[PDB]
Amino acid sequence: DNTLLISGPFKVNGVPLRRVNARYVIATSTKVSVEGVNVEKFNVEYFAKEEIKAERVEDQKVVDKALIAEIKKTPLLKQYLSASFSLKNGDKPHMLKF
Amino acid sequence: VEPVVVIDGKGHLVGRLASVVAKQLLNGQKIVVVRAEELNISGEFFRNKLKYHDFLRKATAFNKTRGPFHFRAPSRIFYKALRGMVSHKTARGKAALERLKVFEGIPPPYDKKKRVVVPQALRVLRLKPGRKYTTLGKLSTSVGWKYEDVVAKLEAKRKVSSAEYYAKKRAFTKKVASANATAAESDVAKQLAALGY
Amino acid sequence: MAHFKEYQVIGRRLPTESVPEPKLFRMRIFASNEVIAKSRYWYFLQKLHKVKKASGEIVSINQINEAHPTKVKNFGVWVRYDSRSGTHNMYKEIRDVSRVAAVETLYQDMAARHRARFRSIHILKVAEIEKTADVKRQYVKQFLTKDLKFPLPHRVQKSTKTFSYKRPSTFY
Amino acid sequence: AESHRLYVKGKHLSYQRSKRVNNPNVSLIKIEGVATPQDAQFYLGKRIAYVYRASKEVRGSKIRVMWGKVTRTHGNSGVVRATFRNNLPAKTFGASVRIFLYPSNI
Amino acid sequence: TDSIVKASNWRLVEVGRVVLIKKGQSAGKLAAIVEIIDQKKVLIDGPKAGVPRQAINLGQVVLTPLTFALPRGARTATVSKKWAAAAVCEKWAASSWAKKIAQRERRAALTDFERFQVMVLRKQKRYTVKKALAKA
Amino acid sequence: VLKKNPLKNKQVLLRLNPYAKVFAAEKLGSKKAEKTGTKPAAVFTETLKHD
RNA sequence: UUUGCUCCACACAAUAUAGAUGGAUACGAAUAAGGCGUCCUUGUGGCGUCGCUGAACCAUAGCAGGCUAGCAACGGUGCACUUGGCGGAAAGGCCUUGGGUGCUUGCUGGCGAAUUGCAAUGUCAUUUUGCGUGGGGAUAAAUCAUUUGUAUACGACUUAGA
RNA sequence: AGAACUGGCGAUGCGGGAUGAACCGAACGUAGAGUUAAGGUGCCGGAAUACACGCUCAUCAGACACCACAAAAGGUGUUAG
RNA sequence: GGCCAGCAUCAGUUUUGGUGGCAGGAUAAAUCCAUAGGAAUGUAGCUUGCCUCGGUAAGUAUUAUAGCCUGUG
């Protein structure tokens, strides 16, 4: 549906498996190998409205373990992923390398 | 970029600074001008005294009390040049003029705050070396301003207090640099230098 | 009138039955484009020979480049101009890097010091000064002195901010 | 943290206008930090929101928001042209305005 | 008795004086003055930095305190030889001017992840400075 | 009901001028010329650089 | 003139806005010259270093920012108090002492976030006034009328009368 | 004041010349977007306190066609010849 | 199934960048390389005359312990 499937991970910053639009997202340069993840199960019909449904909770726990293993490889990435991005005084987004 | 910008009027040109401030006032930026008695005007002293006398004789014939008001203070002379650069007869132009404060010397709390200059308005950066210039404080005294010695006495007292503050600040800054130099030769100092810090 | 170029233009004075193969006059024209260069060529042949644009054609137009475009030379230029009163002849020397660049500054200098527009200046000759001490103007002699070093005892560097937090310094 | 700003501050200068005639349909916005049309090209299409306070309670809040977008550059000093859904009240000449980073192209 | 007069050292426009182009296509490269055309135009050559030999205006360049012996009107091959012999590019990189310049593209090249790491590192360093400053 | 401009709409650019498909095959606009190099006579060079 | 008036802590309301959303971050002076550091016979001194913009500096990580466990430090910082000093140009601010308490991301952890469902400023200011709780304080005048004539067209002015 | 040719005003708004029946640009259904004319880009005022070469200091400088005035004659003022 | 918006893929009009392949000129001119000739705002050397053991000062000297210019390829 032209959207992006994202994860925090939920254990790191509290952002679960969610769906967002690509136009409201700034893509940075930090890269993590996602070639250990079972993303093909999730699709458009997976996010159907029809509190929090119980079955999707363990899907969040089975996906985040495949990322936090590699997050611990590069130092300070876990603390980086738990910190909110913000613009400070003097910051110019037209020259800020992301 | 700042809530209130304090501009030091010393060494500036009355016309090039007013046009800078008038544009900033219309954009919604509050401007405070201090030391208006040290403003500079291009041309010799006799040129500007004759120009003010031409302005001084302009008054309404049948009632002098409702004609052009010839203000003598250096702050108001700079204000008169700035007032004609703003559409002051409209509501938008009146609101811009309430964002401006001009004083002789450096008044209270604006004396404890940082003062800036306008690079495209300094006399040293616009005038050819050799051109004659006039000081606004001397010109105002020759046309009827009687507070030159009062401001000069208060300004001399202020500089003594600010010199004592700078001695404490300069000594404290040297103590900070000694601890920052000892912070070098460490792991966190070399890692910061790799990232341009 | 613009950033100049140097052209060579050849007219022919179109053949009649009585006179085939004419003399093929040639000039060097300083202009911005080929259209003005051909126009200035006909303007001068109309001042020297019984020929105009309708009575002749342009055989060839070629752009002349500097042989050494990056070697500083001294150029002695003779000009004839029209003033508000009459016509006068000048000789000036310009120290520059090419014939085209030296001509470009001459039009700026002629307009600045004599109020002479482009339409009122005729370039008689642009010639190179081969030897030192053949330069006759003092403002060119100054830069031919041995071991020339001159400072700039003032520094107005341009700024980009309306406000600066330190007073500028003109050290140099 | 101390700052939660995800936008850049701007200033409503005036409408698109001639010497004596103005066009309220197009507003001129000065974005801080921008001084060239080349740097202003990054902000093309970015969403503009004007936050102002009202008196009557509308939906449990006294703040109403007027939305817009950056259309093109204006001049050689980084000023940009803006068209909002509804034109600005012309009393906001010099008022602060918010330019967001979305829709993002980075 | 002393006859002191202040010297007030200045950067002279001279043959061999190294310039730094600030406006134009180069915008930050190093060149050397070859010959002086007039009071406002000079001939420069930046063969090691890639600057073509050209007649430039003095307002587009800023003189550097570096100077090396160069003959007047020396060609590009001659200029490049004396440039490497004097090691102009090595003296320039050791100056605080270039180290301040090279610092500002490094900050401009910082990614969002690196900008977070600089924040963390400055917090560790600030702890040591505050401890050392509060005990003396 | 609406004029579609060629040179930006390739489908219209293929409707008119069917040779445009062939024009893109050998690319027809970057063709390398045969390397000449015969030199002009001396009288042309002396005249060009004449005073 | 039916418990009114004023001030402080707070609670509920309305009213008002030329436009808060990391920090207005304090020598002076010169510009054909200076800043800083250091030495010295303390000078218009010697030496070193810096500029070429604030593109800086400080601040900045946590549910707009939670719940807790420690380690290393005796710091950093907020708040209510308190000690002392300075500041009158529009001072109404600045510096500093003592402890109390909270936080600390300087370092190592353990849980909590989702469903606000793909963006809808997502409310976070202070301004005056009103109204109630209760913690202190204060206990008047002016005008008309009468009168005076240093005043006066009329108002005004100048006086007087428990 | 009286003729010749043509274009205009009168019968004509619009952008520009601060201002004007004639000048410059351009002529007009109702709207949107883009690009320009003439004229402008220190501020009033939308747009470079752009760049480049020079000239000028004026104890009544100068600043833009129509246009709202200035001369003969002078100056060891300064610049170029 | 209205009203107000977002995104995607398109069409029409248009604005602002990045980048590729070619064709022309003196088949750019230069730089560069090779060769010959030459000059001074005359490099080393030589020589002369002053001088805090060397730094200058004017004669010689056409590339040497610097270089440049011009022609040709």
Swiss-Prot record, chain A:
Keywords carried by this UniProt record: Acetylation, Cytoplasm, Isopeptide bond, Phosphoprotein, Ribonucleoprotein, Ribosomal protein, Ubl conjugation
Reported modifications of this chain: N-terminally acetylated by acetyltransferase NatA.
Chief localisation class: cytoplasm
Subcellular location: Cytoplasm
GO biological process: cytoplasmic translation; ribosomal large subunit assembly
Disulfide feature: none
Subunit structure, interactors included: Component of the large ribosomal subunit (LSU). Mature yeast ribosomes consist of a small (40S) and a large (60S) subunit. The 40S small subunit contains 1 molecule of ribosomal RNA (18S rRNA) and 33 different proteins (encoded by 57 genes). The large 60S subunit contains 3 rRNA molecules (25S, 5.8S and 5S rRNA) and 46 different proteins (encoded by 81 genes).
Role according to the record: Component of the ribosome, a large ribonucleoprotein complex responsible for the synthesis of proteins in the cell. The small ribosomal subunit (SSU) binds messenger RNAs (mRNAs) and translates the encoded message by selecting cognate aminoacyl-transfer RNA (tRNA) molecules. The large subunit (LSU) contains the ribosomal catalytic site termed the peptidyl transferase center (PTC), which catalyzes the formation of peptide bonds, thereby polymerizing the amino acids delivered by tRNAs into a polypeptide chain.
Annotated protein name in UniProt: Large ribosomal subunit protein eL6A
Species this chain originates from: Saccharomyces cerevisiae (strain ATCC 204508 / S288c)
Curated annotation (Swiss-Prot), chain B:
Subunit (UniProt): Component of the large ribosomal subunit (LSU). Mature yeast ribosomes consist of a small (40S) and a large (60S) subunit. The 40S small subunit contains 1 molecule of ribosomal RNA (18S rRNA) and 33 different proteins (encoded by 57 genes). The large 60S subunit contains 3 rRNA molecules (25S, 5.8S and 5S rRNA) and 46 different proteins (encoded by 81 genes).
Record protein name field: Large ribosomal subunit protein uL13A
Localization, UniProt: Cytoplasm
Alphabetized GO MF terms: mRNA binding; RNA binding; structural constituent of ribosome
A cellular component annotation (GO) from this entry: cytosol
UniProt entry tagged with the keyword Ribosomal protein: yes
InterPro entries in the cross-refs: Ribosomal_uL13, Ribosomal_uL13_CS, Ribosomal_uL13_euk/arc, Ribosomal_uL13_sf
Keywords assigned by UniProt, alphabetized: Acetylation, Cytoplasm, Isopeptide bond, Ribonucleoprotein, Ribosomal protein, Ubl conjugation
PANTHER family per record: LARGE RIBOSOMAL SUBUNIT PROTEIN UL13 (PTHR11545:SF3), RIBOSOMAL PROTEIN L13 (PTHR11545)
Species of provenance: Saccharomyces cerevisiae (strain ATCC 204508 / S288c) (Baker's yeast)
Swiss-Prot record, chain D:
Keyword Cell membrane: no
Subcellular location: Cytoplasm
Chain coiled-coil ranges: none
Database matches in SUPFAM superfamilies: Translation proteins
Cross-link position per record: Glycyl lysine isopeptide (Lys-Gly) (interchain with G-Cter in ubiquitin): 46
One GO-annotated biological process of the protein: ribosomal large subunit assembly
InterPro entries assigned: Ribosomal_eL33, Ribosomal_eL33_CS, Ribosomal_eL33_sf, Transl_B-barrel_sf
Location of N-acetylalanine modifications: 1
Similarity comment: Belongs to the eukaryotic ribosomal protein eL33 family.
Subunit note: Component of the large ribosomal subunit (LSU). Mature yeast ribosomes consist of a small (40S) and a large (60S) subunit. The 40S small subunit contains 1 molecule of ribosomal RNA (18S rRNA) and 33 different proteins (encoded by 57 genes). The large 60S subunit contains 3 rRNA molecules (25S, 5.8S and 5S rRNA) and 46 different proteins (encoded by 81 genes).
HAMAP family according to UniProt: Ribosomal_eL33
Function, in words: Component of the ribosome, a large ribonucleoprotein complex responsible for the synthesis of proteins in the cell. The small ribosomal subunit (SSU) binds messenger RNAs (mRNAs) and translates the encoded message by selecting cognate aminoacyl-transfer RNA (tRNA) molecules. The large subunit (LSU) contains the ribosomal catalytic site termed the peptidyl transferase center (PTC), which catalyzes the formation of peptide bonds, thereby polymerizing the amino acids delivered by tRNAs into a polypeptide chain.
Classification via PANTHER family: 60S RIBOSOMAL PROTEIN L35A (PTHR10902)
Entry protein name: Large ribosomal subunit protein eL33A
Swiss-Prot record, chain E:
Keyword S-adenosyl-L-methionine: no
Superkingdom of origin organism: Eukaryota
PANTHER family, per database record: 60S RIBOSOMAL PROTEIN L14, LARGE RIBOSOMAL SUBUNIT PROTEIN EL14
Gene Ontology BP annotations: cytoplasmic translation; macroautophagy; maturation of LSU-rRNA; ribosomal large subunit assembly; ribosomal large subunit biogenesis
Lineage: Eukaryota, Fungi, Dikarya, Ascomycota, Saccharomycotina
Compartments it resides in: Cytoplasm
GO cellular component, one term: cytosolic large ribosomal subunit
Record-stated family: Belongs to the eukaryotic ribosomal protein eL14 family.
Entry-linked InterPro entries: KOW, Rib_uL2_dom2, Ribosomal_eL14, Ribosomal_eL14_dom, Translation_prot_SH3-like_sf
UniProt protein name: Large ribosomal subunit protein eL14A
Modification(s) after translation: N-terminally acetylated by acetyltransferase NatA.
UniProt main location, coarse: cytoplasm
Other information: Present with 45300 molecules/cell in log phase SD medium. There are 2 genes for eL14 in yeast.
Keywords noted in UniProt: Acetylation, Cytoplasm, Ribonucleoprotein, Ribosomal protein
GO molecular function: RNA binding; structural constituent of ribosome
Subunit structure: Component of the large ribosomal subunit (LSU). Mature yeast ribosomes consist of a small (40S) and a large (60S) subunit. The 40S small subunit contains 1 molecule of ribosomal RNA (18S rRNA) and 33 different proteins (encoded by 57 genes). The large 60S subunit contains 3 rRNA molecules (25S, 5.8S and 5S rRNA) and 46 different proteins (encoded by 81 genes).
Pfam families tied to this protein: KOW, Ribosomal_L14e
CDD domains: eL14
Organism: Saccharomyces cerevisiae (strain ATCC 204508 / S288c)
